[PDB]
Amino acid sequence: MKSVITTTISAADAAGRFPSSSDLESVQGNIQRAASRLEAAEKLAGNHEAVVKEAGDACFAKYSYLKNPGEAGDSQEKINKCYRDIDHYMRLINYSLVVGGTGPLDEWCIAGAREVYRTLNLPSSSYVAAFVFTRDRLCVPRDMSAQAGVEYGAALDYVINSLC
Amino acid sequence: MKSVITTTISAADAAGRFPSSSDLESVQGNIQRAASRLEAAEKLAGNHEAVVKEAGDACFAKYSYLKNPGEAGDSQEKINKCYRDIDHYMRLINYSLVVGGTGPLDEWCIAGAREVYRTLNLPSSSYVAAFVFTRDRLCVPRDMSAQAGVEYGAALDYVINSLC
Amino acid sequence: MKSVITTTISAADAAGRFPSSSDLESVQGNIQRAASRLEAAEKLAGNHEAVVKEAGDACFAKYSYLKNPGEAGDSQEKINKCYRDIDHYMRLINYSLVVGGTGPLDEWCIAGAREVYRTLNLPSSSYVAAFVFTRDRLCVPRDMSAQAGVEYGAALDYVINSLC
Amino acid sequence: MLDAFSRVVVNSDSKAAYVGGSDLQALKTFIADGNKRLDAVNSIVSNASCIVSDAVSGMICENPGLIAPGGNCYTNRRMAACLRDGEIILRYTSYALLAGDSSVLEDRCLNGLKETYIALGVPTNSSVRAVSIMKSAAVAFISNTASQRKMATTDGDCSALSSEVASYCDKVAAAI
Amino acid sequence: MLDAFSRVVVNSDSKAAYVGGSDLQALKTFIADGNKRLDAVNSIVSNASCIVSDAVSGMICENPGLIAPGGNCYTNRRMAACLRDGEIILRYTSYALLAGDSSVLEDRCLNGLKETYIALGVPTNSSVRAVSIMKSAAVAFISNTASQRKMATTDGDCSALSSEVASYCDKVAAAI
Amino acid sequence: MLDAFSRVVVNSDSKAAYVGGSDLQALKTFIADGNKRLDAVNSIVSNASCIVSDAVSGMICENPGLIAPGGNCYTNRRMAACLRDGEIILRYTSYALLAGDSSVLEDRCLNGLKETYIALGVPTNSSVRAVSIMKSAAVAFISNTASQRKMATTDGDCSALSSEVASYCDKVAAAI
Ligand SMILES: *[C@@H](C)C1=C(C)C(=O)N[C@H]1Cc1[nH]c(/C=C2\N=C(C[C@H]3NC(=O)C(CC)=C3C)C(C)=C2CCC(=O)O)c(CCC(=O)O)c1C
Ligand SMILES: *[C@@H](C)C1=C(C)C(=O)N[C@H]1Cc1[nH]c(/C=C2\N=C(C[C@H]3NC(=O)C(CC)=C3C)C(C)=C2CCC(=O)O)c(CCC(=O)O)c1C
Ligand SMILES: *[C@@H](C)C1=C(C)C(=O)N[C@H]1Cc1[nH]c(/C=C2\N=C(C[C@H]3NC(=O)C(CC)=C3C)C(C)=C2CCC(=O)O)c(CCC(=O)O)c1C
Ligand SMILES: CCC1=C(C)/C(=C/C2=NC(=C\c3[nH]c(/C=C4\NC(=O)[C@H](C)[C@H]4CC)c(C)c3CCC(=O)O)/C(CCC(=O)O)=C2C)NC1=O
Ligand SMILES: CCC1=C(C)/C(=C/C2=NC(=C\c3[nH]c(/C=C4\NC(=O)[C@H](C)[C@H]4CC)c(C)c3CCC(=O)O)/C(CCC(=O)O)=C2C)NC1=O
Ligand SMILES: CCC1=C(C)/C(=C/C2=NC(=C\c3[nH]c(/C=C4\NC(=O)[C@H](C)[C@H]4CC)c(C)c3CCC(=O)O)/C(CCC(=O)O)=C2C)NC1=O
Ligand SMILES: CCC1=C(C)/C(=C/C2=NC(=C\c3[nH]c(/C=C4\NC(=O)[C@H](C)[C@H]4CC)c(C)c3CCC(=O)O)/C(CCC(=O)O)=C2C)NC1=O
Ligand SMILES: CCC1=C(C)/C(=C/C2=NC(=C\c3[nH]c(/C=C4\NC(=O)[C@H](C)[C@H]4CC)c(C)c3CCC(=O)O)/C(CCC(=O)O)=C2C)NC1=O
Ligand SMILES: CCC1=C(C)/C(=C/C2=NC(=C\c3[nH]c(/C=C4\NC(=O)[C@H](C)[C@H]4CC)c(C)c3CCC(=O)O)/C(CCC(=O)O)=C2C)NC1=O
Ligand SMILES: CCC1=C(C)/C(=C/C2=NC(=C\c3[nH]c(/C=C4\NC(=O)[C@H](C)[C@H]4CC)c(C)c3CCC(=O)O)/C(CCC(=O)O)=C2C)NC1=O
Ligand SMILES: CCC1=C(C)/C(=C/C2=NC(=C\c3[nH]c(/C=C4\NC(=O)[C@H](C)[C@H]4CC)c(C)c3CCC(=O)O)/C(CCC(=O)O)=C2C)NC1=O
Ligand SMILES: CCC1=C(C)/C(=C/C2=NC(=C\c3[nH]c(/C=C4\NC(=O)[C@H](C)[C@H]4CC)c(C)c3CCC(=O)O)/C(CCC(=O)O)=C2C)NC1=O
Ligand SMILES: CCC1=C(C)/C(=C/C2=NC(=C\c3[nH]c(/C=C4\NC(=O)[C@H](C)[C@H]4CC)c(C)c3CCC(=O)O)/C(CCC(=O)O)=C2C)NC1=O
Ligand SMILES: CCC1=C(C)/C(=C/C2=NC(=C\c3[nH]c(/C=C4\NC(=O)[C@H](C)[C@H]4CC)c(C)c3CCC(=O)O)/C(CCC(=O)O)=C2C)NC1=O
């Protein structure tokens, strides 16, 4: 799981080194940034249902054609799965915010996503629309602190760039 | 076993590809040439005893020195083994004609042959004489059709070139 | 175990060759030099206690600081281990003289020695002093024949160079 | 690997025999049905995406635990790996159909698959279900009885080829 | 490898849950003790040579057969290999302490160690003794109670960190 | 690998002893017979082709099933592989004779040979027969009693060396 801690430790391990000053300093950075990203994680975990609902609504409001027969949202079960997927992504972002790195996203949502979405006719633009809406909907300080939003928006941007 | 089919399939497998147009076309070639080579195979399998006898006779008529003491044909059992070897080769040619490739020859007669014949003092020129006689003795259309002979002579030439 | 015999055989094995003239000639060299090095081995094995005692005495006479607290010879058990180590080295030299190569030294004393001596604060200069004393103390023909001394001194020089 | 012809040759070699007239007759039958065999392969490879994604999706909709946390299709990485396995298996089955012999499938795909899946934790029961769905799909495309796509061929009888396709899928299911 | 944070995330993922407030509280405790954790690691790595050589020497002085002919520390090659193993184990224990999770140690050091030592003939009982001596040494350096070296820190309570160090050394001893 | 000298040294090292006078005497005996040992090796390597091909041919003429379809010497590929194995074994036996120790043979040739032959299907009984024919041939060439080739040496007694050659061939037969 990609994080400050695992990245530094793996670097040391590859060179067969004990932790030294630079490794301790990296962890210190994790301590320093923890407050903002744990705030963002806590805010997201306490309100994810409304966030997911709004995001999925934005996806289908922007792409009504998804509800046409033969398309990804042509049945209620498929629409439900769309909202479920958005939920999975928000959960992985919650995890990324807690870990301090993109590891949970990289391993549990991004790896293999393109093969899945192409075999399943799930247009990438729809997920991107859900995440763009979420990023633009964030209101500071109404929803979280400035730096918490920097962390939250950065994770959302990382997801979007993975789908670009 | 080297054939049109195995060659094309292995090529596709190395690239992780399903069969496509070129693979199907190759097999079509196997269908087209099957008539001539199966005719040659059938003719050979129905008369191999006389063919082998004639070939071995030609080898010892050209190389009487083989019957001298210390040479490869200095006893009756060794002469018998010589005719047996020629039989094995004609059988492998029968197999090559059926498969449509040189695979049976390559794996069951040619691979390791030079090491064997050198350790056993079996002069390559003797086998070549048996096969040259057989190639030159073929009579068209008395023995088989023109294209059947093209296939039969080609397999014989392949064996000869392997011993060159 | 590095020797004339093993070196030549391994060379032949790497090339998949039977022994040939050069391999037999190498062993002949082992036969020729055996007399001098077996004499040196026999002389060493029959008087090793006095040799070791003299060598250790020379080490501590040259480096009295070793007996200071915190140093390698600050207790009687550690001094005893110093003489024991010198004994081990003389035994390995005895083995090298018998084998005709540096193999026993290379594998049983030199490999890993630097890591051990650095982790154990054992100064290399002390072992070198013991071996230099031994090399310079050798008296010809009082102690052994000229060529026996060439072999004995060469093994000692090899040890010293390993610690340089 | 062997094809139908080299299979005959290996069997003949077991007896140091020249290829018997009976075997030559059978191979001539194989030749006579060659065009049908090529249409059969074309019908599978031209719909491989449909076959694989429908079979993996069916496996999942019959067993939704596969996509719950802990399910072997949970996360995109695992679903992608499973779609890839479905495609690989179909590819080797199509090679066996083109060659007329199951050696390519047995040697380059199935040899060790059971142990590998045990090591990884891939459920064998779910795998056999995906493979049997692909089996029904592939047979339908061979017989040109898929509901949603047709492939125009000259009329005739390809039951033997569909039976062959099914026998290869059965080898896959048996091996795991 | 996982750290304390990714460990929490993996546990949460088992339930398809967002990270619970209880877990967030615990991680905030980890953050609050971060500086103490860094001092703990510094105290071990700054004395790694002392720790390892004292532990290997202790193992030997309690069992001198190790350095007799046939002993697994006999010859410089074996002693060097054993000092290297002691250092490697301490290094992975320090990684576990920095990360707050034992996964790095279990996966990159201990996985297969028992079998390897069986294959080579390294005595497991002597190994556990070296590791438990390192355990006592490391704990002392964490708690700043080593007799011969002190490390100046601001006064406080690092019992939890020393207990963690000990639990990692115990994993090592248990694995072999 | 070890030779006769390093073998003595390894045995001495087991006791942390300097090489005993008794061992030195034995090694001096080895030196004294050095020229005979070199003639012995020359007599084998100078007739290696004869030895190997006669032994493989004998193995086959005593068991003609080896060259029937299904026999492990059937086809030129298998016969060539078997002649190569006979040569390899003789080569390692000649190394053991040159070195005066069987370690080279045990470690670089025989270690794993039994399992390999089980895996491949090479018949062990036929292998031992080829090796024992080579044994008789090699002994004859050492003792200069081969019927069809003589090797001129100064007269003397090489029974010990032929016994050694036989003991190495026996190790080969025992290992499989
Ligand atoms: C691919 C896009 C398809 C086209 C084109 C078409 O016309 N039919 C598709 C392929 C196909 N599939 C089958 C057989 C089965 N497919 C199954 C999975 C579906 N069943 C479900 O409950 C779900 C809901 C998510 C899925 C995806 C199953 C089950 C079968 C039956 C397997 C069996 O045991 O018989 C066929 C062949 C026959 C048929 O029409 O069902 C084809 C051509
Ligand atoms: C490293 C140079 C040390 C400094 C600095 C220091 O102040 N103490 C050294 C490290 C250290 N070692 C321990 C614990 C033990 N060390 C042992 C080995 C020694 N015991 C022997 O009999 C010998 C004689 C050759 C050796 C090398 C042993 C045993 C222990 C006890 C392990 C146990 O089971 O408790 C400690 C921690 C506590 C202590 O002071 O003993 C430290 C800091
Ligand atoms: C190599 C070309 C030879 C020369 C030169 C020579 O003078 N003798 C040849 C080598 C040789 N072989 C043996 C022992 C045996 N060789 C055997 C195989 C032959 N026996 C058969 O029935 C056949 C017929 C095809 C073959 C090839 C066998 C059996 C033995 C006996 C093994 C045993 O168990 O004793 C010898 C040594 C003694 C001897 O003269 O037989 C030599 C020098
Ligand atoms: C597997 C393929 C195959 C070969 C290679 C083959 C060779 C072959 N040709 C033969 C006869 C013959 N082959 C020929 C050749 C010819 N006849 C003509 O009309 C031509 C002018 C002339 C050469 C161009 C002749 C004249 C004979 C009978 C005379 C003889 O035995 O030499 C015979 C003796 C058995 C028999 O009389 O039929 C053999 C074995 N038979 C086969 O089945
Ligand atoms: C393994 C090989 C080996 C070595 C290295 C060795 C060293 C050695 N030389 C010694 C004696 C001696 N060695 C010498 C050296 C010399 N005598 C002369 O005639 C020369 C002029 C002069 C040097 C060129 C002398 C003078 C003594 C006796 C005086 C003394 O103890 O220092 C002693 C004391 C034991 C004894 O009296 O024999 C040892 C241990 N002994 C051995 O077996
Ligand atoms: C934990 C991380 C994780 C992710 C991210 C994930 C995505 C994911 N969504 C799926 C299904 C699906 N996902 C969707 C979603 C969509 N419908 C639309 O209209 C939109 C285009 C689109 C979303 C924007 C749909 C429709 C399906 C069903 C596709 C089908 O069966 O035809 C599948 C295939 C298995 C299944 O049916 O559940 C995966 C692997 N699965 C995971 O385990
Ligand atoms: C020679 C042809 C060939 C085959 C057959 C093959 C199979 C294969 N599938 C794998 C993984 C996998 N395979 C699956 C497949 C599935 N999970 C389910 O629930 C479904 C029932 C099932 C469909 C079979 C999954 C999920 C993984 C990932 C395992 C993991 O990530 O933990 C792996 C381990 C490496 C990897 O992750 O890609 C192999 C070797 N690889 C090849 O080269
Ligand atoms: C390049 C690869 C290649 C292909 C693809 C190919 C197709 C092909 N299929 C044919 C016949 C045929 N194709 C079929 C196949 C079937 N009929 C049905 O109703 C079944 C559903 C279907 C399932 C496979 C049949 C029955 C025939 C007629 C009998 C025969 O000629 O074999 C013919 C001969 C008559 C013609 O169309 O000109 C060709 C050339 N030939 C090739 O060389
Ligand atoms: C068979 C080949 C072999 C060799 C060569 C060898 C060397 C060797 N000497 C050691 C110890 C030691 N060796 C010495 C020797 C010294 N004291 C001094 O004053 C001098 C500087 C120095 C020698 C010149 C000392 C003091 C120790 C104990 C170090 C300690 O525990 O603090 C050790 C560590 C294990 C032990 O305590 O016995 C090794 C491996 N061990 C072997 O098995
Ligand atoms: C992933 C981290 C890692 C570990 C854990 C590791 C262990 C390890 N220790 C080894 C050897 C060895 N290890 C020891 C250690 C000791 N002998 C004793 O008596 C002591 C009780 C004991 C301390 C544990 C010894 C003596 C050898 C040499 C074995 C020999 O030369 O015969 C070897 C075989 C290769 C070599 O000689 O270096 C491995 C793989 N290597 C790695 O990369
Ligand atoms: C670059 C790596 C790095 C290090 C090394 C580091 C050390 C460090 N340790 C601190 C406090 C402290 N450090 C300790 C540690 C301990 N006190 C004891 O008596 C125990 C024996 C000892 C065992 C580890 C304690 C108790 C505190 C005070 C409580 C706390 O601030 O966490 C502080 C905060 C107050 C200060 O000193 O300015 C820092 C910056 N910070 C970093 O970023
Ligand atoms: C299935 C494919 C296949 C082939 C091709 C084959 C060739 C072959 N022929 C052999 C023997 C032999 N082959 C011959 C043949 C000859 N005598 C002569 O005068 C001519 C020079 C020469 C043929 C032109 C002879 C004489 C031997 C016995 C050699 C001996 O033992 O001294 C042997 C050694 C084993 C044996 O004694 O049977 C092989 C491997 N074996 C196979 O399994
Ligand atoms: C380290 C020295 C060394 C040895 C000992 C060795 C043995 C060896 N013999 C092999 C094959 C073989 N070995 C034989 C030998 C024989 N068949 C019989 O019937 C005879 C009784 C028997 C004589 C022993 C045969 C026939 C094969 C081919 C197996 C096959 O092609 O199916 C193989 C498999 C790879 C290959 O085909 O070459 C090995 C590794 N390779 C080495 O590098
Ligand atoms: C370059 C490799 C090399 C070789 C090949 C070699 C041969 C060699 N063999 C010798 C003696 C001898 N060689 C033999 C060997 C034997 N006598 C028999 O009747 C046995 C059948 C036979 C079986 C091996 C014997 C008995 C002696 C005389 C005793 C002896 O000097 O060892 C001698 C000493 C006398 C002389 O010929 O000048 C040499 C140099 N020396 C070398 O350095």
Coordinates of C-alpha atoms in Angstrom, one line a residue, chain F:
Chain F
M1 CA 34.9 -30.5 -5.0
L2 CA 37.6 -32.3 -3.0
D3 CA 40.7 -34.3 -4.1
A4 CA 42.5 -36.9 -2.0
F5 CA 44.5 -34.2 -0.2
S6 CA 41.5 -31.9 0.6
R7 CA 39.6 -35.0 1.7
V8 CA 42.3 -35.7 4.2
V9 CA 42.2 -32.0 5.3
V10 CA 38.4 -32.0 5.8
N11 CA 38.7 -35.2 7.9
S12 CA 41.4 -33.5 10.0
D13 CA 39.4 -30.3 10.3
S14 CA 36.6 -32.4 11.9
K15 CA 38.9 -32.8 14.9
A16 CA 40.7 -29.3 14.7
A17 CA 43.9 -31.3 14.2
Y18 CA 47.0 -30.7 12.1
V19 CA 47.4 -33.4 9.5
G20 CA 48.6 -36.5 11.2
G21 CA 51.8 -38.3 10.2
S22 CA 49.7 -41.4 9.3
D23 CA 47.7 -39.3 6.8
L24 CA 50.9 -37.7 5.5
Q25 CA 52.2 -41.3 4.9
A26 CA 49.1 -42.2 3.0
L27 CA 49.3 -39.1 0.8
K28 CA 52.9 -39.8 0.1
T29 CA 51.7 -43.2 -1.1
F30 CA 49.3 -41.4 -3.4
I31 CA 52.2 -39.3 -4.7
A32 CA 54.4 -42.3 -5.3
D33 CA 51.6 -43.9 -7.5
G34 CA 51.0 -40.6 -9.3
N35 CA 52.5 -41.7 -12.6
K36 CA 50.4 -44.9 -12.5
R37 CA 47.3 -42.8 -11.8
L38 CA 48.1 -40.6 -14.8
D39 CA 48.5 -43.7 -17.1
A40 CA 45.2 -45.0 -15.8
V41 CA 43.4 -41.8 -16.7
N42 CA 45.1 -41.7 -20.1
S43 CA 44.0 -45.3 -20.8
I44 CA 40.4 -44.4 -20.1
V45 CA 40.2 -41.0 -21.9
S46 CA 42.1 -42.3 -24.9
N47 CA 39.4 -45.0 -25.4
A48 CA 36.3 -43.1 -24.2
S49 CA 34.4 -43.5 -27.5
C50 CA 35.0 -47.2 -27.6
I51 CA 34.0 -47.6 -23.9
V52 CA 30.7 -45.7 -24.3
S53 CA 29.5 -46.9 -27.6
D54 CA 30.3 -50.6 -26.7
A55 CA 28.5 -50.2 -23.4
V56 CA 25.3 -48.6 -24.9
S57 CA 25.3 -51.2 -27.7
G58 CA 25.7 -54.0 -25.2
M59 CA 22.9 -52.7 -23.1
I60 CA 20.7 -52.7 -26.2
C61 CA 21.7 -56.1 -27.7
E62 CA 20.9 -57.6 -24.3
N63 CA 17.5 -55.8 -24.2
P64 CA 16.2 -55.1 -27.7
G65 CA 12.9 -53.7 -26.3
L66 CA 15.0 -50.5 -25.7
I67 CA 14.9 -49.9 -29.5
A68 CA 11.3 -51.0 -30.2
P69 CA 8.6 -48.3 -30.4
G70 CA 8.2 -47.1 -26.9
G71 CA 11.7 -48.2 -25.9
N72 CA 13.7 -45.5 -24.2
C73 CA 16.4 -45.7 -26.9
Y74 CA 13.8 -45.5 -29.8
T75 CA 14.4 -42.8 -32.4
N76 CA 17.8 -41.1 -33.0
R77 CA 17.1 -38.3 -30.5
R78 CA 16.8 -40.8 -27.6
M79 CA 19.8 -42.9 -28.7
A80 CA 21.9 -39.8 -29.0
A81 CA 20.7 -38.6 -25.5
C82 CA 21.7 -42.0 -24.1
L83 CA 25.2 -42.0 -25.7
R84 CA 25.6 -38.5 -24.3
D85 CA 24.7 -39.7 -20.8
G86 CA 27.1 -42.6 -21.1
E87 CA 29.9 -40.2 -22.1
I88 CA 29.0 -37.7 -19.3
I89 CA 29.1 -40.5 -16.7
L90 CA 32.4 -41.8 -17.9
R91 CA 33.8 -38.2 -17.9
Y92 CA 32.9 -37.7 -14.3
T93 CA 34.3 -41.2 -13.4
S94 CA 37.6 -40.1 -15.0
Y95 CA 37.5 -36.9 -13.0
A96 CA 37.1 -38.9 -9.8
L97 CA 40.1 -41.1 -10.9
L98 CA 42.3 -38.1 -11.6
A99 CA 41.4 -36.5 -8.3
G100 CA 41.4 -39.7 -6.2
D101 CA 38.0 -38.7 -4.6
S102 CA 34.4 -39.3 -5.6
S103 CA 33.1 -35.9 -4.5
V104 CA 33.2 -34.5 -8.1
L105 CA 31.1 -37.4 -9.3
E106 CA 28.7 -37.3 -6.4
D107 CA 28.1 -33.6 -6.4
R108 CA 28.2 -32.6 -10.1
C109 CA 26.7 -35.8 -11.7
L110 CA 24.9 -38.1 -9.3
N111 CA 23.1 -35.5 -7.1
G112 CA 19.6 -35.7 -8.3
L113 CA 20.2 -38.2 -11.2
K114 CA 17.8 -40.8 -9.8
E115 CA 14.9 -38.3 -9.5
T116 CA 15.7 -36.9 -13.0
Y117 CA 15.6 -40.4 -14.5
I118 CA 12.3 -41.1 -12.7
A119 CA 10.8 -37.9 -14.0
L120 CA 12.0 -38.6 -17.6
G121 CA 11.2 -42.3 -17.7
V122 CA 14.7 -43.5 -18.3
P123 CA 14.9 -47.1 -17.1
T124 CA 17.3 -47.4 -14.2
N125 CA 17.9 -51.2 -14.7
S126 CA 19.1 -50.5 -18.3
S127 CA 21.3 -47.6 -17.0
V128 CA 23.0 -49.8 -14.4
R129 CA 23.7 -52.3 -17.1
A130 CA 25.3 -49.7 -19.4
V131 CA 27.4 -48.5 -16.4
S132 CA 28.5 -52.0 -15.4
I133 CA 29.6 -52.7 -19.0
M134 CA 31.6 -49.4 -18.9
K135 CA 33.0 -50.6 -15.6
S136 CA 34.4 -53.8 -17.0
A137 CA 35.7 -51.9 -20.1
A138 CA 37.4 -49.2 -18.1
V139 CA 39.0 -51.7 -15.7
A140 CA 40.3 -53.6 -18.7
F141 CA 41.9 -50.5 -20.1
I142 CA 43.4 -49.6 -16.7
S143 CA 44.9 -53.1 -16.4
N144 CA 45.8 -53.0 -20.1
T145 CA 43.8 -56.2 -20.8
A146 CA 41.5 -54.9 -23.5
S147 CA 41.6 -57.5 -26.3
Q148 CA 41.6 -55.1 -29.3
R149 CA 43.8 -52.2 -28.1
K150 CA 47.0 -52.2 -26.0
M151 CA 48.6 -49.2 -24.4
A152 CA 52.3 -49.6 -23.7
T153 CA 53.3 -48.9 -20.1
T154 CA 56.2 -50.0 -17.9
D155 CA 55.3 -53.2 -16.2
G156 CA 53.7 -53.1 -12.7
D157 CA 50.7 -53.4 -10.6
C158 CA 47.6 -51.1 -11.1
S159 CA 45.1 -53.3 -9.2
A160 CA 44.4 -50.5 -6.7
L161 CA 43.6 -48.0 -9.5
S162 CA 41.2 -50.4 -11.3
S163 CA 39.6 -51.2 -7.9
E164 CA 39.1 -47.4 -7.5
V165 CA 37.6 -47.1 -11.0
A166 CA 35.2 -49.9 -10.2
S167 CA 34.2 -48.3 -6.8
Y168 CA 33.3 -45.1 -8.7
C169 CA 31.2 -47.0 -11.2
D170 CA 29.6 -48.8 -8.2
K171 CA 28.7 -45.4 -6.7
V172 CA 27.0 -44.5 -10.0
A173 CA 25.0 -47.8 -10.0
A174 CA 24.1 -47.4 -6.3
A175 CA 22.9 -43.8 -6.8
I176 CA 20.3 -44.8 -9.3

